[PDB]
Symmetry: D2
Subunit: 221 residues, 4 copies
C-alpha cells in the first residue's frame, strides 16, 4: 500500500451523520490486562467475560480462523474501539460490546518504562507541529496508537465534533522500520454504519514501537 | 384487579439473569420537559428528538392508536425507564433509547411546590417503616412513582443488586381515590428480556397524586 | 367482549402495505400431528423440532408461564399462522418460523368423521350467503377456524389481494354455547408489522365445535 | 493468487450446520433482466423493486462506493445467490432478499446463441469427468458460473445434501485468457452464517466466456 491519491480520500462535507465517528474516538476505549477467553460465537472471533461502564460481555472478530484459534487459550491484552449498535454475543445477552482486533500477548511484551513515540502533523503541506503518545507494550496494535492519536487531535485541534468537522480530508500514516507503510482514512463513505467503518482494525496489525513513526496529513477546505 | 394470591408471585431465586433488572432501576431515568413529537414508527408510538448520555433519539410505545394520535402534537412531560437491547427507531439510527408510557400534558398539570406522597412498607406482614418521594405533577404516571419508590429501597434496604436479591416476593400497590386498586410484580418470569417485563408501563396509567396512596409488601426468604 | 362499534373498526383503505396480510392467509399455514417440544427460549413459549417448506425449527409464544409449562411434556397438535420477519429461536438457527398459540392436546380430542360447521356472512346488513369448513378436533383453536374461514372468502369473494381490499370493514364473530362471544378486526392499524397483528392468537383460545357458531360482517365502501 | 495448499482447505466433516450451504445452491437463484435501481441504504449497495416467490424487494452489496455509483442508473442484469436470515433493506419492509455482486450491463453484452463452456472435474488426482453449463452473456459473473457448476454436481454427484457431504475438500478454479486464475473453497469455516460465506461474490468479478475455462478438485475421504 503506497501513499494515497487526493481523489481517493473521502470528504467530511458529504458525510451525513458524521458525529457517529466522534463519540467513537471521544469516549473511553476498552482496556483489559491479563485476561483469558471463555467461549466464541463464530470460528473467527473470541468472547471474553469482562466488564465496563456499559457491558459485562465482550466480542472481537479477528482476521481469520487460524488467528482466533491461536489466542484461544493464551493470556492477552485488550485495547479497542467499541460499538454497541448491531452486535451479537449470545441469545441470552443484553449489555454487549463488540470490537475488532486489539489483541496482544501478555508475557514478555510488557515494558518497565513508557516508550516515547513522536507524531508529526502536516496541514496544507506545511509541517505545523509535534506531540507525544505513550504505551506499555513492545508490540502494539495500530489500533491502540491510531486511537490515542486522534483523541488528542480531537480535544485540542478538533478533529471531530458533535457535528461538522473543521477539516475535509485526513489520514494517518504508519512507518515501520522493516517495510511497507500503510494508512487509514479519517472519514467514512457518505452513508455508513459504525460496525463497518471499524473493520479496518480487523487484521490485528501489530508493530514494534521502539522503531516506528507516524504521520498525519490534513486539508483545510 | 384484586389483591394477589401468594402463589401468583414470581420468586427471585428462580430468575437467572436477574441483575438486568437492577440496572434498569439503578440508572438514570429519561427526563424531558415541554417537548413535542417529530415522527412515529408504528400507529401507536411517538418518537422524540431529544438527547441524553446514551442517545439522541427516543421512542415510547403507547397503549394504542387512539392514544398516540392524541399526544401526537401536544407539548408533554416525559418521565420513564428505558431499554437499549432490542430497540428500533429508524433505519439510519445508531444511539437509541426506547420506553413505555411516561407521557403527560405539560400545561397546568405542573405544581408550585412538591406534593409529599408517603409510602408504607410491609415485610413478612409487619409494617416496619415509611419514607417519602416527590413529584412536580398533578397527574403523575404510576411509572414515575414506581421508579422513585424502588430506587430508594434498592440503594438502602437493597431490593436489587448486581446479583441475587435479598428478598423473595415483592410487589407494589396503588390506591386511587376514585376506585379499583392495582399492582405490579417486582420480579419477572425465570427467563426474560428487558423489553417484555416493562410492558406493564404500556397503559400509560395516570392518576391524581393529591389523593393516592402506596404500599409495598415484601417476604423475606 | 360485546358487539363492536362501527367506529372502532380499522378501515382497509388506510393501511399502506396491506398486502402483507394477504400472504399470511393465502399461504400454507403450519400443521403438525402428535409431537413433543424440546427446548424453550423464554418462560412462556415452546420450541419444536419440525420441518416445512421454509423451516426446520419452530416457536410458539403462548399466553403466560403457567400455560407453556403445561404442554412442555405433552403430545400436542399445532395448527397456526406463521411469520418470518422478526423471529428469534436460537443464536445458531437460520430458517426459522414463529407463531402464536395453536396448541391442543392430542389423545382423545380427535374425531372419526369431520364435524360440519356453518358460517353466515353479511354484507352491508343483508345476510348474503353460507359456506362450509371442516375440522378433525373436538376442541379447536379459533385460529385454525379463523384461518379456514378467510382463506375461502379470499380466494372466492377476495377478502385480501396483492393490494387494496375490495371491502372496508369486517370482523369475524365467535358464538360459543356457554358464554361471551368474541371478535377479531380483519384489518391492522395503519402502520404495522406482522408479529404484532398476529398477537390475537396468543390466548390460545379454544372451544367445543359441536356447539359453536360463526358470523362475518363486512362493509362495501 | 496461486494454487491452494492442501492444508488451507476447509473440511466439511468439521462443519456443523452445513445443510445451510445446501439450500443455497439447491434453491432457485435470483434472476432479473433489464432493470433499474430505485434507492440505496448505504453507499456501497443498490436496491431493486423486483419480485420472486419469497420477496418483493432486493439488495446487493457491491465492492465499494465507486462501483455502486456506477450501476446506479444503468440497465443491468441480476443473477445471484440469496440469503434471507439477517437482511436489512428499509425500516418498513418485511419480505426481503439480499445478495452480493451479480450485476452486469444489459445492452449489447447479450448473445444470440448460448456459449458452451466445458468444466473439467478431478477426483483424487484422476480427471474422472466433464460436463456443460449455459449462459446468455458475453461478460459473465463468476457467481452465475460457480452456481450453475454446483447445482449440477449436487443434484448428481451429490456435493451437498441435507446433511454431511460425501466429499471432504473441494474448490473450483477459474482460468481467464489474459491472467491470474482464482478459486473458492466449497466449504465454510466450522461455524459461520450465510451472509459471511457469500462475501466472495462481493468483488463482483467478471470475465469473458468465449475464452474462460473451469476446473474442480475434490477429495474423497
Amino acid at each position: 500500500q503506497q501513499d494515497p491519491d487526493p481523489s481517493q480520500l473521502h470528504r467530511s462535507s458529504l458525510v451525513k451523520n458524521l458525529q457517529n465517528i466522534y463519540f467513537l474516538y471521544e469516549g473511553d476505549p476498552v482496556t483489559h490486562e491479563n485476561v483469558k477467553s471463555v467461549d466464541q460465537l463464530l470460528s473467527h472471533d473470541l468472547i471474553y467475560n469482562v466488564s465496563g461502564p456499559n457491558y459485562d460481555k465482550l466480542k472481537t472478530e479477528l482476521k481469520n480462523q487460524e488467528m482466533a484459534t491461536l489466542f484461544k487459550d493464551k493470556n492477552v491484552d485488550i485495547y479497542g474501539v467499541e460499538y454497541y449498535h448491531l452486535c451479537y454475543l449470545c441469545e441470552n445477552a443484553e449489555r454487549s460490546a463488540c470490537i475488532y482486533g486489539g489483541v496482544t500477548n501478555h508475557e514478555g511484551n510488557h515494558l518497565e518504562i513508557p516508550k516515547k513515540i513522536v507524531v508529526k502533523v502536516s496541514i496544507d503541506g506545511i509541517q505545523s507541529l509535534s506531540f507525544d503518545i505513550e504505551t506499555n507494550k513492545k508490540m502494539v496494535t495500530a489500533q491502540e496508537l491510531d486511537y490515542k492519536v486522534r483523541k488528542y487531535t480531537i480535544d485540542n485541534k478538533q478533529l471531530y465534533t458533535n457535528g461538522p468537522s473543521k477539516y475535509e480530508t485526513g489520514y494517518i500514516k504508519f512507518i515501520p522500520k522493516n517495510k511497507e507503510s500503510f494508512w487509514f482514512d479519517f472519514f467514512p463513505e457518505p452513508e455508513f454504519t459504525q460496525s463497518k467503518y471499524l473493520m479496518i482494525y480487523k487484521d490485528n496489525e501489530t508493530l514494534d514501537n521502539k522503531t516506528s513513526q507516524i504521520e498525519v496529513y490534513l486539508t483545510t477546505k
